[PDB]
Design a protein around this ligand. Sequence first.
Ligand SMILES: [Cu+2]
Ligand SMILES: [Cu+2]
Ligand SMILES: [Cu+2]
Lengths: 158, 153
Amino acid sequence: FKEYPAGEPVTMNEMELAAVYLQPIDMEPRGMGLPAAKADVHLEADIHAVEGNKNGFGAGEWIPYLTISYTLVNNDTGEKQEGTFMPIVASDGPHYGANIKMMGVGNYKVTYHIEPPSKAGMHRHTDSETGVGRWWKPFDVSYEFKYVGLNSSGLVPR
Amino acid sequence: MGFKEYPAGEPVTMNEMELAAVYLQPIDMEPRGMGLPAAKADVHLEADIHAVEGNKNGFGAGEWIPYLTISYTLVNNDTGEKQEGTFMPIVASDGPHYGANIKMMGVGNYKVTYHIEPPSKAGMHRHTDSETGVGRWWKPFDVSYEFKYVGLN
Ligand SMILES: [Cu+2]
Ligand SMILES: [Cu+2]
Ligand SMILES: [Cu+2]
């Protein structure tokens, strides 16, 4: 299952945030996201702390409890799609993502709208000895990538 | 130098996770509203849960297990009194954990049981493909810890 980068990684709020896509992936449970057979790609957000993180995460650690929605735009046509990622585990670890129905060939921009763990129920110590400070404000990161589809082998045509 | 934290019982390793229990002084948490404020509690009780080597649910050794749903049953064996509650996911300076501020039920020998439900209950999904997939979650299960509580300190 071949992975393709979407744009360039960005470092923001002491996290590294990358976007990747691959062929649609069957997931359990069912009912929240689009089924694989009804999608064109599986789109992911890879998000991990970097050194100096002030919210309690060590370098390289996954950031859990994020709420992440996406705005996908095919800039060739102007077509826009809104959706929301789920937290997902795979053999190479936890991430966020969704199966997506794409909008044809084009130069795309995808924006990930990211809310901090407080919005999904994660609390924080506030004592002087073990406390951490307030969360960063919800923020956006965007990726620009050229999309032509994936073929029956799950590969980008050459 | 020693951190003021009191182990509750002994760690156990089940379902390819190491599960430990500790308590400390009540801790004020944000956001406010959910759960007992520190002023109305006697201890802050924690669940310390990380994968061990060989975990098949996608977590590397030592990694925090996120998206668990954990409830507790606390019994003072000296008086018979029981309390049931839930833990919250929490981050502190040394990382994510689960816990709650607790009003205790007097000095005594206690048992605390953690009922643990897998990340699927709180919305975590899994790839099921041949290449990157992980299999079914384990079923909900109980772990318990016995400790002598005399107050702090
Ligand atoms: Cu995925
Ligand atoms: Cu936004
Ligand atoms: Cu805590």
